[model samples]
Target chain A: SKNVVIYADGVYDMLHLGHMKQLEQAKKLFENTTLIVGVTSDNETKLFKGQVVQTLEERTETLKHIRWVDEIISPCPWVVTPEFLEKYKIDYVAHDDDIYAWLKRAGKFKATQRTEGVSTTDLIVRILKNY
Target chain B: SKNVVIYADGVYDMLHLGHMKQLEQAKKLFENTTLIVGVTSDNETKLFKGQVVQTLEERTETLKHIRWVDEIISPCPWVVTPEFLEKYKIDYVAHDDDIYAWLKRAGKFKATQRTEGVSTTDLIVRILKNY
Candidate 1:
């Protein structure tokens, strides 16, 4: 691809090292690839099961600081649809989860896994213990 | 100084790119140097006049992922006392504010200003808007 567009999504609240590290890794999936983040709105984030600490706008504001994140969906769509892929000019929707089987089946998924010991859950628990 | 340690103190409640950029600047001050962050305790942070969103532990965990941060003072002290500097072997206290001119006169200050556009307050305001 002359200019590969790699898309990823998340709530990205708290904006930790784990988030940056994964995106850093994602940016490396291909040469000349641009990374776009589709930040889930607070309402959509309830599915993940935790408090929606920061809103989509807040998450996008912080994610902008990261050197790699190129474009953001603002309030990303709930599901990765063909319209999304085409509108964003995305070559693939990259993720660190195993459940993207449908995306892989659609030939639009790029898989990666989260780094061990670096998670929003662990970070939250750490705060709960100390705070 | 054979070994100069540059110390910076903050709540770091929301560790962001602004924080990282300054730390990267701090690391450039001299040779044989180390960057130590004195993350203020949750209680002490009340003086800042805002909600202490992330606990000290949570902030520390997030800060550790940055490539430039070398060491973290988990519950960083409130003020930079002489004893605190001696205990940590820190020679200078780095800051982005001019209020630390006192430290500069004492020959123990490092100056690096925050990037103009990004801030925790703005981030919060952004969330308030869309959240």
Candidate 2:
């Protein structure tokens, strides 16, 4: 009813344009929104993505510089629960993937498109070839 | 006199925060400044550094999305010439490094501080170690 509180969570290892674009989408999703970016912990990131380049502190600190971001929560859970949403006062869970089946089923999921051809892996490969 | 015309150029392969921060500095250098970003060609990038993840078109296209960028000039030379400055009608050449000693001598250089702990190379190293 008031300003919508949008929640977006991710590994956000290198904090590239793709991540920024998604966050931008989240911020602009509604007419007025308070976007909260949630950063996953090192343990969870390792379990899910096999590795994380930046630590929880570094990742969260970097996110603070982005203009679109309103607030940030660190060590966010891998799975979004009802309690989690209530605790954070979140109205919607935003992400590029619709893997949050529970959130989608609850009608609180907002989807964003992933930027193509650019990723941490791709950047690494390019650097390896050049350097 | 009129609007200040500022020029900044680079390989801009990955288009990361370091590059963005420098461009932002250039845009905010003067009250009324038009920021023109010049992209080096693949061949020149090879000679200066080596290889680019994104091609000239890709690099330039990505740069357009940045809010601070007013115009783009592609295939910029390794060395800035007086003719080149005159052709572009540039008032100042902005960069973190004073590699353009001639521009500085000619009183046409503005400096921007590089964002610490973040660079395309650093990002690549982090990725390589993890992935």
Candidate 3:
């Protein structure tokens, strides 16, 4: 392949070092990879998960500055469909968990590790407690 | 006036990019700078603020790897006193806010810019909302 297209999607609220490290892993998962990060839409996030601190615009804009990110897709689907993968020509899905059964079963999933003791929720709790 | 020793202290619960950025600014605040990051004791943190996700040992261990940090002071005092500054030879205290009125009044404070929309608390909120 001329360029390995790796896809990773997330709410990316606050854009912590954990997210940065994961994206770095995804980008370096394979040489010559064009890492395409997809930011979930606010509506989908609200419907599925909950409210996001950052707007879609803000999240996407931040992603642009991360050196690991090659490209971005905002208002991305909550679910990455087969058609979606095909359309984007994504060779692999990078994530820490097996949330995407289809991708894993297809042997297109590249596992990433979650940074221990760090998460968006834990950070919020720290804030609420400290300040 | 050989080295501008900068002191920064925090719970450093999760050690996010925001914290990292702040440390970076502190390290680069002046030429020939030495950045000393202080991690408050678990007891002090619980007493003053609340519980922290990482223990003092763990927090200090992680701080060791941050390139910007020249020294790590675990179980650092909750209050940066005049005696403390004299003992450590810290020239200026680096913080985003004027939490230390005495330091500000003494002109021994160098303001650091907070990475807006990114914080330990905000990160925790994102996790709670989404996950």
* Stretches > 4 Å off in candidate 2: A1-5, A31-34, A47-49, A61-71, A75-89, A98-102, A115-117, A126-131, B1-5, B28-34, B47-49, B61-90, B98-102, B115-117, B123-131
Cα TM-score per model: 0.56, 0.70, 0.52
**lDDT per residue, candidate 2, B20-104, as tens digits?**
7788899999999999999999988987798577889878866765768899989788878899899989999998774578888
Model 3, position B86, has a per-residue lDDT of 96
Best by DockQ: 2
RMSD per prediction, one decimal?
7.7, 4.4, 7.0
Q: Using alpha carbons, what is the TM-score of model 3?
A: 0.52
Which of 1 and 3 is the better model by lDDT? 3
Which pairs clash inside model 1? none
Candidate 1: residue A83 Cα off by (Å): 1.3
Question: Model 1, B1-131: lDDT tens per residue?
Answer: 67668887777766766787788778768876788877888887877555676777767767766655678887877767778888888888888775666677888887788875466556445646764
lDDT by residue (B27-127, candidate 3, tens digit) is 99888999999999999898889867677876776566565889988889888889999999989999887357888899899888767656555644565
lDDT of 1 by residue, A14-55 (tens): 676678877877777888899998888887678755667566
Model 1 chain A weakest lDDT span, ten residues long = A118-127
| Prediction 1 global C-alpha lDDT | 0.75
How far does residue B63 in candidate 1 sit from its true spot (Å)?
A: 6.3
Report, for every candidate in turn, its global Cα lDDT versus the true structure: 0.75, 0.82, 0.81
How does chain A of candidate 2 score by TM-score against the true chain A?
0.88
